[PDB]
Design a binder for this molecule. Structure first.
Ligand SMILES: NCCCC[C@@H](N)C(=O)O
Length: 305
């Protein structure tokens, strides 16, 4: 009866992505919507009768601190609580807002910010450094990482950073506003670092390949010259990092609020930022960290380089 937008978050492990194998995030969401009585059962079976859309089709294993979806529901009392009561702890609806009927979240959002949490031995040189959990990131290596990541900034032909895309395809070009790596931190004897990237839009496997290539370079499996060569017309076999560390941090609506905001209303989750950071630190990060500690996801992939 009313078109709403939802701010939600989830740990991606144990799912096969957001949309569409294991269950998906939307499977849990739909079930929670049906059980709570926000939508009738047929709206859950056919996700078009409630006009359901999602901003980011996060891949298998990928987490999200600020996923955004839009749909029509029965605005039942305490709707946020009710929906959450049918969800596991690792999926939370953080915010809800009533929007105009014509609002399409996927078609209206601009830039996305992702982070990538990884063990620091992903930057350990294969010839000079230890290759296990005992490795500690040096200041010089971090400088190298940030120097390389900075080269991604601006507009480039990113055809080598996805699949089945030609160099002459205009849609292969993408815009990177920012990319860097934060200072490392230790948790339970393991050192991690957070890579953050902001882009106007991303192609399939793009961030994982951007990270993978820099990892290959820093570790010494590829010369630095391959980076600048990668945005040329030539094809480059770019390594694809695991999806475990990848987290969707924010879906931006700044350009939407400017261009459309003045049949449309401004969308802003600034008030829910506390819950966003809380869920990331309490449910997203610890699962990634624990998984790396016990299953050695990154280490296994690094072996294949
Ligand atoms: N929408 C294309 C993919 C973007 C990256 C991230 N959302 C993922 O699927 O892993």
């Amino acid at each position: 009866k009313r078109k709403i937008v939802l701010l939600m978050a989830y740990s991606g492990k144990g799912y096969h992505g957001m949309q569409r194998q294991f269950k998906t995030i939307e499977d849990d969401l739909v079930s929670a919507l049906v059980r709570s009585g926000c939508i009738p059962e047929n709206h859950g079976e056919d996700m078009r009768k409630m006009s359901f859309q999602r901003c980011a089709r996060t891949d298998k294993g990928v987490s999200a601190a600020g996923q955004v979806v839009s749909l029509k529901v029965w605005l039942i009392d305490d709707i946020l609580e009710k929906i959450n009561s049918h969800l596991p702890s690792h999926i939370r609806i953080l915010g809800l807002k009533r929007v105009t009927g014509g609002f399409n979240s996927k078609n209206r959002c601009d830039a996305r910010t992702y982070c990538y949490l990884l063990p620091t031995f992903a930057f350990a040189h294969k010839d000079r450094d230890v290759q296990d959990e005992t490795y500690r990131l040096s200041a010089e290596t971090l400088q190298q990482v940030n120097r390389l990541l900075a080269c991604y900034k601006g507009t480039h032909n990113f055809h080598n950073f996805t699949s089945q895309k030609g160099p002459q395809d205009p849609s292969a070009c993408r815009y990177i506003l920012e990319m860097y790596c934060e200072e490392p931190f230790v948790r339970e004897g393991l050192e991690f670092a957070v890579i953050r990237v902001k882009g106007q839009s991303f192609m399939m496997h793009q961030i994982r390949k951007m990270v993978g290539l820099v990892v290959a370079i820093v570790k010494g499996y590829a010369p630095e010259s391959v980076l600048e060569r990668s945005w040329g017309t030539e094809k480059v076999d770019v390594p694809k990092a695991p999806g475990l560390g990848l987290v969707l941090e924010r879906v931006h609506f700044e350009k939407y609020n400017q261009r459309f905001g003045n049949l449309h209303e401004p969308l802003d989750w600034a008030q829910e930022e506390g819950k966003v950071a809380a869920f990331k630190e309490e449910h997203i990060y610890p699962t990634i960290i624990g998984t790396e500690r016990d299953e050695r996801s990154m280490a296994q992939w690094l072996s294949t380089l």
